[PDB]
Amino acid sequence: SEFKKKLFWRAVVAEFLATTLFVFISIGSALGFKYPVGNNQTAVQDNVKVSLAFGLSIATLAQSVGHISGAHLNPAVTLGLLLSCQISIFRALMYIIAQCVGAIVATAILSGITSSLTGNSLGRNDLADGVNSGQGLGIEIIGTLQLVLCVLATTDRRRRDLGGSAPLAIGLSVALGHLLAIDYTGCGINPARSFGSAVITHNFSNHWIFWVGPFIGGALAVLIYDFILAPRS
């Protein structure tokens, strides 16, 4: 085909342009505690605020480019479908890689508008005071797992029983991760979102855990659904 070949590229575009808006609006809104409405006197973050803002941002982009890429926006999600043999071997590489770019470009646009922040966070997920060093995977490896469990089930197509909005579904499962790992890291349930969070801002401390699991956990879900709960005939 000399058309489908070109319909592939438009998806990888609809993957970059979507993730940048996702990162920008979400990670940007996360920096609302240090940024007041009165003076310099610092505030305290709302767990719910950054849960919905990140969650709803997915359900918004999901309804916006689903029909074009599959609105993965997350390399953990991308790995889920790849292991379920849904997507193409190379499509996984084209989405993941261009997805990381979106997080770099948004951080780059935000870097100009921020500045006023007392510590200059510019989007960062850090193993908080008390949270297990390295073992912070203990949450995430069975944390990000719920989202790829949703994504895989919300797409059965064998299934005649679905209803409502599929994005609002999956996007609410993004507010689940954000409602969970809020006090833990600053919630980094998306490897590309966490990677492009500190690459030009610079701080690669514990970044290897915000990549490896996800990934394994999201792939564990494939076995839970595609091999245990809803395996193909």
Encoding tokens for residue 213? 């699991």
In the complex, the smallest distance separating the C-beta of residue 12 from a second copy, rounded to whole angstroms, is 11
In the complex, the smallest distance separating the C-beta of residue 71 from a second copy, rounded to whole angstroms, is 10
Residues 123, 19 contacting (CB under 8 angstroms): no
By CB under 8 A, name the one of 46, 85, 93, 208 that touches a second copy: 46
Q: How far apart are CA 56 and CA 62, in angstroms?
A: 9
Q: Which stretch binds a second copy (CB under 8 A): 87-95, 124-132, 200-208, 211-219?
A: 124-132
Q: Does 134 bind a second copy (CB under 8 A)?
A: no
Q: Does 220 bind a second copy (CB under 8 A)?
A: no
Q: Does 73 bind a second copy (CB under 8 A)?
A: no
Q: Does 14 bind a second copy (CB under 8 A)?
A: yes
Residue 75 or 143: which CB sits closer to a second copy?
Answer: 143
Q: Does 2 bind a second copy (CB under 8 A)?
A: no
Which of 169, 104, 181, 173 is closest to 139 using CA atoms? 181
In the complex, the smallest distance separating the C-beta of residue 85 from a second copy, rounded to whole angstroms, is 20
Within 13 A of 144's CA, how many CA atoms are on the CB side? 31
Residue 204 or 231: which CB sits closer to a second copy?
Answer: 231
Q: Does 28 bind a second copy (CB under 8 A)?
A: yes
In the complex, the smallest distance separating the C-beta of residue 142 from a second copy, rounded to whole angstroms, is 6
Residue 79 or 110: which CB sits closer to a second copy?
Answer: 110
Q: Does 104 bind a second copy (CB under 8 A)?
A: no
Q: Which stretch binds a second copy (CB under 8 A): 80-88, 89-97, 108-116, 207-215?
A: 108-116
- At a CB cut-off of 8 Å and minimum separation 6, what does 130 contact? none
DSSP 125-185: ----TTS-TTTTHHHHTTTTHHHHHHHHHTT-SS-S---S-HHHHHHHTHHHHHHHTTTTT
Which of 25, 15, 80 is closest to 54 using CA atoms? 25
Number of residues that bind a second copy (CB under 8 A): 86
Q: Does 212 bind a second copy (CB under 8 A)?
A: no
Encoding tokens for residue 28? 């940007």
Q: Does 135 bind a second copy (CB under 8 A)?
A: yes
Which of 180, 152, 192 is closest to 18 using CA atoms? 192
Q: How far apart are CA 33 and CA 226, in angstroms?
A: 41
